[PDB]
Curated annotation (Swiss-Prot):
Domain remark text: The normal, monomeric form has a mainly alpha-helical structure. The disease-associated, protease-resistant form forms amyloid fibrils containing a cross-beta spine, formed by a steric zipper of superposed beta-strands. Disease mutations may favor intermolecular contacts via short beta strands, and may thereby trigger oligomerization. Contains an N-terminal region composed of octamer repeats. At low copper concentrations, the sidechains of His residues from three or four repeats contribute to the binding of a single copper ion. Alternatively, a copper ion can be bound by interaction with the sidechain and backbone amide nitrogen of a single His residue. The observed copper binding stoichiometry suggests that two repeat regions cooperate to stabilize the binding of a single copper ion. At higher copper concentrations, each octamer can bind one copper ion by interactions with the His sidechain and Gly backbone atoms.
Family statement: Belongs to the prion family.
Subcellular location: Cell membrane; Golgi apparatus
Subunit description: Monomer and homodimer. Has a tendency to aggregate into amyloid fibrils containing a cross-beta spine, formed by a steric zipper of superposed beta-strands. Soluble oligomers may represent an intermediate stage on the path to fibril formation. Copper binding may promote oligomerization. Interacts with GRB2, APP, ERI3/PRNPIP and SYN1. Mislocalized cytosolically exposed PrP interacts with MGRN1; this interaction alters MGRN1 subcellular location and causes lysosomal enlargement. Interacts with APP. Interacts with KIAA1191. Interacts with ADGRG6.
Protein name: Major prion protein
Function: Its primary physiological function is unclear. May play a role in neuronal development and synaptic plasticity. May be required for neuronal myelin sheath maintenance. May promote myelin homeostasis through acting as an agonist for ADGRG6 receptor. May play a role in iron uptake and iron homeostasis. Soluble oligomers are toxic to cultured neuroblastoma cells and induce apoptosis (in vitro). Association with GPC1 (via its heparan sulfate chains) targets PRNP to lipid rafts. Also provides Cu(2+) or Zn(2+) for the ascorbate-mediated GPC1 deaminase degradation of its heparan sulfate side chains.
Keywords: Amyloid, Cell membrane, Copper, Disulfide bond, Glycoprotein, Golgi apparatus, GPI-anchor, Lipoprotein, Membrane, Metal-binding, Prion, Repeat, Signal, Zinc
Intrachain S-S bonds: C56-C91
Clinical note on disease: Variations in PRNP are responsible of transmissible bovine spongiform encephalopathies (BSE), a class of neurodegenerative diseases that affect various mammals. These diseases are caused by abnormally folded prion proteins. BSE can be subdivided into at least three groups: classical, H-type and L-type, with the latter 2 collectively referred to as atypical BSE. Susceptibility or resistance to a BSE disease can be influenced by at least 3 factors related to the host prion protein: protein expression levels, number of octapeptide repeats, and specific polymorphisms.
Source organism (scientific name): Bos taurus (Bovine)
GO MF annotation list: copper ion binding; G-quadruplex RNA binding; identical protein binding
Length: 104
């Protein structure tokens, strides 16, 4: 039943900066192997910003690792650090979209 979560529609993957020009293509040339949809709750439930984001990160990162590892892909430790910020950024965006229309 995937607990009882909400998964969003496909997201714009932000070009988050790092520093090494390597990582900028290690991102771009590789976008498709990192997520574009994160797994969360409506702003109703886990009614925080970053404390919802950490669960969204944890669930998405963990669902995606297992699945993609079970398809014969490996992740480097910087792939973890570059996935986490991308996942947090996109998930933050998906909450903020809702709360900004809740309020308006």
């Amino acid at each position: 039943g995937l607990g009882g979560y909400m998964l969003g529609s496909a997201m714009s993957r932000p070009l988050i900066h790092f520093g090494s020009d390597y990582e900028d293509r290690y991102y771009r040339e590789n976008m498709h192997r990192y997520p574009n949809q994160v797994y969360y709750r409506p702003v109703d439930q886990y009614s925080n910003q970053n404390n919802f984001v950490h669960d969204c990160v944890n669930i998405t990162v963990k669902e995606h690792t297992v699945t993609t590892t079970t398809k014969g892909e490996n992740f480097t430790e910087t792939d973890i650090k570059m996935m986490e910020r991308v996942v947090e950024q996109m998930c933050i965006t998906q909450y903020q979209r809702e709360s900004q229309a809740y309020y308006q």
